[PDB]
């Protein structure tokens, strides 16, 4: 009686900086990356945008 | 072609002879064409499908052999134990675990219980 | 075909036995199980003949011996008789001891069920026949085996009933002809099955009241099943099988083994015997894919079929003899894809004519001939039964010859 | 010979009222489920087989279920092949109801 094999997995480990960059950086067609999030601008003092 | 034109019902040996040739040469869909005939002439396809499956392995039509056996054995079609040993070993010889495992699962559905020989064949490619 | 007495269904019915669409008959034969009403085709199975475990004997098939409806008391001096019995050879002896014990212990169910069982004057088993009646049989190997088997039970009667015989052990068999009745009953009505009682899967030889009445036919329509939870044996109607309003419902005794020398040993005689034939030799070989082709017999020896959707009722000449002699004969096949050589000088005619010479109308001894059939004399319930066996073997040989000559005549349409 | 033939077989009367309260309380289904499970080895496999058969029933003839409770349908189908009349889908009626709804205690 061959049983219904079911192989699942769950790994965990520290990420390389390249992995984070590939996670977050989005390159526009113009060539800009701009994934750094330079300024700490939470929400405009103006309209909540 | 003249057998149906005249109206005489062909013999059991008649269909048996042709399917042996088509399997020997590698005819994939041609064998199924005859298989429909006995499905209308009140003739069982078990012997014809057994020899057709076995002949396709006697030539290097491994992909054809799995397709014909799986289609016929998906429904109710008991197979001789010799065929089960042949395809499980042959599929594992060329690295066809996906086809071999399905046949082994199909074999156990029809009563026959997998022994150490079948597990040994599977372990060859899983290793 | 008259129904059985009302007491037959009861006594067992009071002990939780339920039969739904059957009614046992009383006419002179094995009581017989014939149905009523119609069932129509079904999907999986229809359960019938609910038989509990308490109404059994079920001695185990291997050491140690255990009886789940406990009959032998603790320390009773009859377990020593059984434990001294040779295993794997004579399972019908300890079973006979259990049957004899279930006749004088208490108001046990078998104390009442004994009356419906066939008596010494009844029964067909050869263990109750005599010397000249065994001699009245066109067979010497069977004669030797049955003469030895009438012994080996005389021997296992004086080893445990010899002038010491505690009254418990005595009074069970005061003479060596009721022990023969018990031995014959054990031989005829024992069945070996698997019994899952609790966490124990075991193989055992069992005796089943109300189920042995199911007569025999090599074309069966009944299964034996053992319900694991409530410990009940049940007969099951086959899936996709229509049932008439009083026709026979049968369960096969032996399958995959026959030759009419062991079935006959176990009772009556073969009628169609789909697994027996006579060795031919004498010739070179006959073709294989024409004997099953003229009658449209399906191959695959383990499972032979006739395909009733054959022709415009081509013939009414198919039987167990045809399906048996279609696979026990030379049957040359060669490459299995030949030209089918219609060389009637070699592939047909003379070769089977040689078989006609080999079967030279009973050439072995021919102790008797057509005169024997229907001598019109019934007596002792064991005579006219060896005669019946001779009749059926002669009929099988004759019909095999007839089928062979029909085949050799019809090779051209 | 044994004098208990009819003393243990006399029919108990007054059973007609103890035939109905089984039928609206779900007693017939409860006593049929165990008889269907009397031969099964693993109950989970039996439950999964019943669920798959009910799924097939819903797929093949969709536009009937919503009232019939196809699980009840497959249970009745399995119980109806060995006698055991068991009306279709164990459907309950209101023989005496010139009104829309019972109070239900």
């Amino acid at each position: 009686m061959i049983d219904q094999y079911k192989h699942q997995q769950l790994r965990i480990g520290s990420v390389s900086p390249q992995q984070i960059s590939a996670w977050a950086t989005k390159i526009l067609p113009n060539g800009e990356i701009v994934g750094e999030v330079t300024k700490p601008y939470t929400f405009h003092y103006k309209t909540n945008k | 072609r003249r057998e149906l034109s005249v109206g005489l019902v062909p013999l059991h040996e008649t269909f048996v002879a042709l399917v042996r040739l088509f399997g020997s040469k590698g005819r994939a869909t041609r064998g199924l064409e005859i298989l429909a005939a006995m499905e209308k002439l009140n003739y069982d396809i078990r012997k014809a499908w057994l020899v057709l499956v076995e002949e396709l392995v006697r030539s290097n039509h491994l992909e054809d052999a799995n397709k014909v056996f799986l289609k016929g054995a998906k429904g109710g079609l008991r197979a001789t134990d010799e065929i089960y040993d042949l395809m499980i070993e042959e599929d594992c010889k060329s690295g066809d675990h996906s086809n071999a495992l399905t046949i082994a699962y199909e074999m156990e559905a029809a009563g026959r219980m997998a022994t150490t020989f079948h597990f040994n064949c599977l372990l060859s490619v899983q290793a | 075909m008259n129904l059985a007495d009302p007491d037959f269904y009861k006594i067992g019915y009071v002990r939780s036995f339920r039969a739904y669409g059957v009614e046992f008959r009383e006419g002179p034969d094995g009581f017989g199980v014939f149905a009523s009403k119609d069932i129509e085709p079904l999907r999986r199975a229809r359960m019938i003949m609910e038989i509990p475990l308490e109404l059994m004997l079920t001695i185990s098939k291997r050491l140690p011996w255990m009886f789940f409806p406990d009959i032998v008391p603790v320390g009773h001096p009859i377990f020593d008789i059984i434990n001294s019995t040779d295993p794997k050879t004579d399972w019908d002896l300890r079973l006979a001891c259990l049957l004899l014990l279930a006749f004088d212990q208490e108001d046990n169910f078998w104390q009442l069920y004994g009356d419906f069982l066939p008596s010494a004057d009844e029964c067909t088993s050869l263990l109750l026949a005599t010397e000249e009646d065994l001699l009245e049989l066109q067979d010497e190997s069977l004669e030797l085996t049955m003469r030895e088997q009438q012994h080996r039970c005389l021997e296992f009667w004086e080893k445990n009933w010899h002038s010491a015989a505690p009254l418990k052990i005595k009074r069970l068999a005061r003479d060596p002809k009721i022990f023969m009745w018990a031995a014959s009953i054990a031989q005829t009505r024992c069945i070996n099955m698997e019994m899952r009682i609790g966490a124990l899967i075991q193989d055992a030889n069992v005796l089943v009241p109300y189920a042995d009445m199911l007569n025999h036919s090599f074309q069966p329509n009944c299964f034996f099943h053992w319900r694991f939870k409530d410990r009940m044996l049940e007969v099951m109607i086959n899936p996709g099988s229509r049932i008439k309003k009083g026709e026979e419902m049968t369960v096969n005794y032996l399958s995959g083994q026959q030759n009419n020398i062991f079935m006959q040993r176990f009772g009556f005689s073969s009628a169609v015997n789909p697994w027996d034939a006579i060795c031919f030799s004498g010739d070179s070989r006959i073709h294989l894919d024409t004997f099953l082709s003229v009658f449209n017999i399906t191959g695959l020896r383990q499972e032979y079929y006739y395909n009733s959707k054959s022709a415009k009722e081509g013939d009414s000449f198919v039987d167990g003899a045809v399906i048996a002699a279609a696979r026990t004969l030379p049957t040359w096949s060669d490459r299995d894809v030949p030209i089918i050589p219609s060389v009637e000088r070699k592939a047909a005619k003379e070769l089977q004519e040689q078989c006609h010479e080999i079967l030279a109308k009973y050439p072995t001894t021919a102790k008797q001939d057509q005169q024997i059939l229907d001598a019109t004399e019934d007596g002792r319930r064991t005579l006219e039964a060896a005669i019946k066996y001779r009749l059926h073997r002669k009929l099988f040989i004759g019909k095999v010859i007839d089928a062979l000559e029909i085949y050799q005549d019809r090779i051209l349409f | 010979k044994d004098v208990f033939m009819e003393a243990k077989l006399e029919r108990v009367p007054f059973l007609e009222e103890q035939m109905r309260k089984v039928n609206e309380g779900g007693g017939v289904m409860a006593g049929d489920i165990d008889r269907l499970m009397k031969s099964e080895d693993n109950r989970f496999a039996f439950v999964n087989e019943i669920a798959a058969e009910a799924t097939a029933y819903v797929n093949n003839n969709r536009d009937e279920y919503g009232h019939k409770k196809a699980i009840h349908h497959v249970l009745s189908n399995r119980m109806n092949d060995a006698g055991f009349a068991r009306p279709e889908a164990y459907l309950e009626t209101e023989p005496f109801s010139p009104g829309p709804t019972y109070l239900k205690e």
Side-chain angles (χ1 to χ4, degrees):
Chain A
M1 182 100 222
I2 324 191
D3 41 343
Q4 264 85 351
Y5 305 110
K6 169 133 88 142
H7 312 103
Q8 280 159 280
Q9 207 162 328
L10 217 61
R11 308 178 82 263
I12 177 150
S14 288
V15 283
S16 68
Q18 307 88 308
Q19 175 57 249
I20 328 166
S21 172
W23 269 347
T25 58
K26 188 69 158 291
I27 277 181
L28 268 199
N30 60 5
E32 84 171 51
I33 323 168
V34 199
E36 164 80 286
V37 194
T38 55
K39 326 173 94 172
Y41 268 142
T42 52
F43 253 113
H44 203 155
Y45 82 96
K46 282 192 196 230
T47 7
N48 224 14
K49 3 101 43 252
Chain B
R1 209 43 186 182
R2 40 212 269 189
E3 269 63 1
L4 57 92
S5 83
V6 169
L8 266 187
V9 277
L11 200 60
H12 190 322
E13 176 24 47
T14 278
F15 307 108
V16 152
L18 269 187
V19 299
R20 183 140 37 220
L21 171 86
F22 293 130
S24 72
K25 204 42 150 51
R27 280 304 113 197
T29 42
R30 281 298 96 76
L32 320 170
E33 264 190 333
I34 304 111
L35 292 178
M38 311 76 78
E39 286 208 283
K40 318 293 297 157
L41 284 179
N42 318 295
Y43 277 159
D44 69 316
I45 71 199
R46 174 140 168 202
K47 263 156 282 286
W49 150 74
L50 272 172
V51 299
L52 191 43
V53 157
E54 190 198 33
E55 208 59 57
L56 283 159
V57 202
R58 294 175 115 267
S59 189
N60 229 20
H61 304 100
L62 244 194
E63 42 175 337
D64 249 20
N66 308 145
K67 174 72 141 143
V68 178
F69 176 49
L70 259 69
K71 176 213 66 47
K74 200 64 66 159
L77 269 192
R78 172 76 173 127
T80 76
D81 309 3
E82 280 77 13
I83 284 308
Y84 282 124
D85 309 345
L86 163 77
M87 321 206 68
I88 295 276
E89 201 211 320
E90 275 256 355
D91 278 279
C92 288
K93 276 193 318 195
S94 147
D96 223 314
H97 185 211
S98 40
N99 285 343
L101 200 33
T102 37
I103 286 150
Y105 279 146
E106 271 205 359
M107 153 165 78
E108 281 163 326
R112 174 133 201 279
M113 283 316 277
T115 87
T116 317
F117 161 65
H118 309 99
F119 284 99
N120 282 323
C121 301
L122 290 158
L123 271 158
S124 69
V125 310
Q126 308 188 33
Chain C
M1 66 277 300
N2 250 21
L3 87 166
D5 316 338
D7 309 270
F8 188 49
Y9 178 55
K10 299 184 263 192
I11 276 175
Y13 162 71
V14 186
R15 292 166 181 79
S16 320
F17 156 85
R18 304 305 148 104
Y20 304 130
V22 307
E23 161 64 273
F24 330 94
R25 304 304 226 252
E26 181 207 341
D29 66 350
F31 253 56
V33 176
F34 297 139
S36 85
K37 190 211 48 163
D38 282 351
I39 81 162
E40 281 154 299
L42 290 165
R43 192 145 331 261
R44 322 163 175 271
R46 163 159 308 202
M47 172 273 287
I48 193 69
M49 252 165 277
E50 253 187 47
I51 306 156
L53 178 55
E54 46 217 52
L55 317 162
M56 285 185 198
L57 280 294
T58 166
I59 180 162
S60 166
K61 207 159 82 67
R62 277 176 278 276
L63 260 287
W65 313 110
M66 313 188 183
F67 325 106
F68 285 126
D70 259 351
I71 306 306
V72 290
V74 202
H76 190 273
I78 213 172
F79 171 80
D80 273 335
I81 284 178
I82 285 166
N83 208 347
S84 74
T85 282
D86 176 33
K88 67 111 184 211
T89 55
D90 47 293
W91 42 265
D92 42 18
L93 286 203
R94 325 168 287 259
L95 200 60
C97 304
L98 262 185
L99 198 133
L100 289 186
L101 185 49
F103 269 130
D104 210 15
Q105 196 180 8
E106 323 145 57
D107 216 276
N108 198 295
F109 173 72
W110 280 90
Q111 206 284 333
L112 312 96
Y113 198 59
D115 299 43
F116 306 112
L117 271 174
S119 184
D121 311 353
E122 314 266 9
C123 192
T124 308
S125 194
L126 309 186
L127 258 79
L128 261 295
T130 85
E131 163 198 355
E132 79 273 339
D133 307 354
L134 182 48
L135 256 174
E136 183 53 54
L137 197 78
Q138 195 194 307
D139 200 348
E140 295 328 293
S141 59
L142 192 53
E143 152 94 29
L144 209 159
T145 48
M146 283 326 233
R147 202 188 295 163
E148 171 264 357
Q149 275 212 107
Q150 292 221 39
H151 257 307
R152 192 209 89 211
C153 329
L154 271 283
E155 206 283 329
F156 203 75
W157 183 87
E158 294 110 21
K159 199 186 165 287
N160 308 106
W161 271 270
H162 52 289
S163 307
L167 259 282
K168 289 172 300 314
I169 294 327
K170 218 192 276 186
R171 99 186 165 223
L172 303 181
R174 286 197 191 280
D175 39 4
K177 84 202 71 63
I178 55 182
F179 199 94
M180 291 325 178
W181 180 58
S184 154
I185 279 307
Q187 291 212 345
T188 45
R189 317 181 98 77
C190 159
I191 51 186
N192 316 351
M193 335 173 46
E194 271 206 350
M195 313 181 66
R196 182 157 153 98
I197 299 295
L200 174 78
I201 279 188
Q202 91 164 1
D203 224 300
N205 320 83
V206 311
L207 258 52
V208 282
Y210 296 132
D212 53 355
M213 297 315 148
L214 286 154
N215 290 303
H216 178 280
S217 156
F218 292 93
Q219 217 67 21
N221 49 7
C222 278
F223 303 150
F224 266 144
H225 196 28
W226 173 264
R227 260 194 278 136
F228 141 82
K229 284 253 159 185
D230 84 277
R231 294 181 199 180
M232 239 182 227
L233 179 141
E234 46 194 9
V235 187
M236 312 272 249
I237 308 295
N238 280 36
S241 293
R242 194 181 301 274
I243 285 304
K244 265 67 178 179
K245 203 202 147 304
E247 89 293 9
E248 204 190 357
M249 286 163 331
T250 88
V251 47
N252 189 0
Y253 287 22
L254 301 176
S255 266
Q257 175 31 295
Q258 194 185 83
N259 293 332
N260 317 345
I261 42 185
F262 332 122
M263 153 57 67
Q264 151 75 55
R265 164 221 316 283
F266 265 48
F268 42 89
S269 174
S270 317
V272 290
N273 52 271
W275 258 97
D276 165 48
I278 168 167
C279 54
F280 292 147
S281 183
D283 72 326
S284 69
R285 260 165 115 74
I286 327 178
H287 187 227
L288 204 171
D289 314 69
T290 37
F291 215 144
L292 91 174
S293 275
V294 292
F295 313 135
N296 314 157
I297 273 292
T298 325
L300 274 176
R301 281 168 44 71
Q302 318 275 330
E303 58 247 40
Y304 256 43
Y305 197 36
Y306 164 100
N307 188 58
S308 181
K309 317 297 184 133
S310 58
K312 48 183 83 163
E313 201 172 352
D315 69 307
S316 293
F317 194 64
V318 85
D319 263 348
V322 193
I323 205 156
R327 44 158 178 259
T328 315
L329 72 164
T331 42
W332 80 254
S333 47
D334 282 351
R335 194 46 199 80
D336 290 276
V337 70
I339 62 169
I340 316 106
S342 186
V343 305
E344 268 66 59
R345 321 302 313 263
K346 179 183 55 200
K349 296 293 173 294
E350 271 42 77
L351 269 298
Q352 35 271 66
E353 273 308 304
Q354 207 49 244
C355 297
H356 288 67
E357 174 40 37
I358 287 136
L359 322 172
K361 276 75 190 167
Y362 314 140
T364 85
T365 183
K367 293 195 280 288
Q368 177 118 224
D369 283 317
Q370 196 266 300
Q371 332 312 329
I372 184 173
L373 84 89
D374 283 87
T376 324
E377 179 64 33
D378 44 349
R380 295 202 41 266
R381 279 309 223 176
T382 165
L383 277 200
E384 171 275 350
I387 290 111
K388 262 323 273 183
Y389 172 71
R390 301 183 40 138
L391 297 204
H392 272 293
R393 184 182 173 79
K394 277 168 194 136
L395 253 61
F396 164 77
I397 296 152
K399 299 229 156 179
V400 159
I401 279 181
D402 292 13
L404 183 40
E405 50 96 7
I406 300 332
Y407 154 73
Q408 94 180 298
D409 292 345
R410 183 163 61 252
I411 318 164
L412 322 173
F413 161 70
Chain D
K1 282 199 161 299
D2 57 336
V3 48
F4 275 130
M5 209 64 168
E6 300 81 17
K8 291 182 189 293
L9 280 191
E10 288 256 351
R11 183 130 161 180
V12 153
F14 308 63
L15 271 164
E16 288 87 5
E17 61 194 37
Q18 286 280 5
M19 291 264 199
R20 161 162 35 85
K21 26 195 81 73
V22 193
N23 281 113
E24 51 284 24
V28 53
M29 213 152 152
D32 272 337
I33 285 183
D34 89 317
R35 194 192 238 132
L36 290 177
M37 213 173 317
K38 183 142 319 174
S39 42
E40 291 306 299
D41 193 338
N42 192 0
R43 52 184 151 107
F44 307 120
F46 164 85
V47 167
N48 265 339
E49 159 208 77
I50 295 307
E53 203 167 320
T55 296
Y57 272 5
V58 174
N59 268 345
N60 84 77
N61 161 32
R62 164 51 211 190
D63 205 297
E64 203 204 359
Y65 293 138
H67 193 317
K68 236 187 189 173
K69 298 305 170 172
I71 289 176
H72 296 216
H73 204 128
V74 52
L75 281 165
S76 47
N77 271 347
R78 292 163 78 97
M79 204 65 191
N80 226 334
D81 68 355
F84 309 136
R86 294 324 174 264
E88 172 104 323
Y90 281 125
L91 268 160
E92 62 273 56
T93 49
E94 306 249 24
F96 324 120
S97 169
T101 41
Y102 198 77
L103 252 194
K104 290 303 189 9
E105 293 177 350

PDB file of all heavy atoms in Angstrom, chain C residues 71 96 152 161 198 203 306 349:
ATOM      1  N   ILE C  71     -16.616 -23.626  23.336  1.00  0.00           N
ATOM      2  CA  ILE C  71     -17.348 -24.854  23.613  1.00  0.00           C
ATOM      3  C   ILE C  71     -16.630 -25.704  24.648  1.00  0.00           C
ATOM      4  O   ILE C  71     -17.238 -26.167  25.614  1.00  0.00           O
ATOM      5  CB  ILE C  71     -17.587 -25.643  22.305  1.00  0.00           C
ATOM      6  CG1 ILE C  71     -18.261 -24.757  21.260  1.00  0.00           C
ATOM      7  CG2 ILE C  71     -18.439 -26.869  22.569  1.00  0.00           C
ATOM      8  CD1 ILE C  71     -19.537 -24.105  21.747  1.00  0.00           C
ATOM      9  N   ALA C  96     -14.681 -32.481  13.727  1.00  0.00           N
ATOM     10  CA  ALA C  96     -15.649 -33.509  14.090  1.00  0.00           C
ATOM     11  C   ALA C  96     -15.767 -33.641  15.603  1.00  0.00           C
ATOM     12  O   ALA C  96     -16.863 -33.864  16.126  1.00  0.00           O
ATOM     13  CB  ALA C  96     -15.259 -34.846  13.461  1.00  0.00           C
ATOM     14  N   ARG C 152      -7.366 -43.961   9.051  1.00  0.00           N
ATOM     15  CA  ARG C 152      -6.827 -42.709   9.584  1.00  0.00           C
ATOM     16  C   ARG C 152      -7.884 -42.004  10.431  1.00  0.00           C
ATOM     17  O   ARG C 152      -7.617 -40.969  11.052  1.00  0.00           O
ATOM     18  CB  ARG C 152      -6.313 -41.806   8.454  1.00  0.00           C
ATOM     19  CG  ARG C 152      -5.471 -40.621   8.899  1.00  0.00           C
ATOM     20  CD  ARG C 152      -5.610 -39.457   7.928  1.00  0.00           C
ATOM     21  NE  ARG C 152      -6.709 -38.567   8.279  1.00  0.00           N
ATOM     22  CZ  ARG C 152      -7.425 -37.880   7.398  1.00  0.00           C
ATOM     23  NH1 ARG C 152      -7.175 -37.951   6.100  1.00  0.00           N
ATOM     24  NH2 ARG C 152      -8.414 -37.103   7.829  1.00  0.00           N
ATOM     25  N   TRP C 161     -10.729 -43.629  22.493  1.00  0.00           N
ATOM     26  CA  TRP C 161     -11.981 -44.218  22.960  1.00  0.00           C
ATOM     27  C   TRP C 161     -11.773 -45.687  23.301  1.00  0.00           C
ATOM     28  O   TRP C 161     -12.593 -46.545  22.957  1.00  0.00           O
ATOM     29  CB  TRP C 161     -13.087 -44.071  21.913  1.00  0.00           C
ATOM     30  CG  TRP C 161     -13.878 -42.800  22.009  1.00  0.00           C
ATOM     31  CD1 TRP C 161     -15.012 -42.594  22.739  1.00  0.00           C
ATOM     32  CD2 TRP C 161     -13.614 -41.571  21.322  1.00  0.00           C
ATOM     33  NE1 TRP C 161     -15.460 -41.307  22.564  1.00  0.00           N
ATOM     34  CE2 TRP C 161     -14.620 -40.658  21.697  1.00  0.00           C
ATOM     35  CE3 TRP C 161     -12.620 -41.149  20.433  1.00  0.00           C
ATOM     36  CZ2 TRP C 161     -14.661 -39.351  21.215  1.00  0.00           C
ATOM     37  CZ3 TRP C 161     -12.663 -39.851  19.955  1.00  0.00           C
ATOM     38  CH2 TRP C 161     -13.676 -38.969  20.348  1.00  0.00           C
ATOM     39  N   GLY C 198     -11.261  -9.045  17.149  1.00  0.00           N
ATOM     40  CA  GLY C 198     -10.967  -7.739  17.703  1.00  0.00           C
ATOM     41  C   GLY C 198      -9.824  -7.085  16.961  1.00  0.00           C
ATOM     42  O   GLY C 198      -9.991  -6.599  15.839  1.00  0.00           O
ATOM     43  N   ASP C 203      -7.020 -16.901  10.349  1.00  0.00           N
ATOM     44  CA  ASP C 203      -7.622 -17.821   9.397  1.00  0.00           C
ATOM     45  C   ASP C 203      -8.151 -19.024  10.162  1.00  0.00           C
ATOM     46  O   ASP C 203      -7.457 -19.568  11.025  1.00  0.00           O
ATOM     47  CB  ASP C 203      -6.606 -18.256   8.340  1.00  0.00           C
ATOM     48  CG  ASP C 203      -7.183 -18.244   6.939  1.00  0.00           C
ATOM     49  OD1 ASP C 203      -8.170 -18.966   6.696  1.00  0.00           O
ATOM     50  OD2 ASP C 203      -6.650 -17.507   6.083  1.00  0.00           O
ATOM     51  N   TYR C 306     -17.810 -16.272 -22.516  1.00  0.00           N
ATOM     52  CA  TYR C 306     -18.440 -16.753 -23.740  1.00  0.00           C
ATOM     53  C   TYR C 306     -18.963 -15.636 -24.634  1.00  0.00           C
ATOM     54  O   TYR C 306     -19.105 -15.850 -25.843  1.00  0.00           O
ATOM     55  CB  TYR C 306     -19.572 -17.735 -23.394  1.00  0.00           C
ATOM     56  CG  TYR C 306     -20.568 -18.031 -24.502  1.00  0.00           C
ATOM     57  CD1 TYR C 306     -20.463 -19.192 -25.254  1.00  0.00           C
ATOM     58  CD2 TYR C 306     -21.656 -17.198 -24.740  1.00  0.00           C
ATOM     59  CE1 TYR C 306     -21.372 -19.485 -26.253  1.00  0.00           C
ATOM     60  CE2 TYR C 306     -22.570 -17.485 -25.738  1.00  0.00           C
ATOM     61  CZ  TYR C 306     -22.425 -18.630 -26.489  1.00  0.00           C
ATOM     62  OH  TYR C 306     -23.335 -18.921 -27.479  1.00  0.00           O
ATOM     63  N   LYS C 349      -8.220 -31.846 -38.580  1.00  0.00           N
ATOM     64  CA  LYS C 349      -8.577 -33.195 -39.010  1.00  0.00           C
ATOM     65  C   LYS C 349      -7.817 -34.280 -38.257  1.00  0.00           C
ATOM     66  O   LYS C 349      -8.090 -34.536 -37.079  1.00  0.00           O
ATOM     67  CB  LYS C 349      -8.341 -33.354 -40.514  1.00  0.00           C
ATOM     68  CG  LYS C 349      -9.210 -32.461 -41.385  1.00  0.00           C
ATOM     69  CD  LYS C 349     -10.675 -32.849 -41.297  1.00  0.00           C
ATOM     70  CE  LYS C 349     -11.553 -31.847 -42.027  1.00  0.00           C
ATOM     71  NZ  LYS C 349     -11.540 -30.512 -41.369  1.00  0.00           N
TER      72      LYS C 349
END
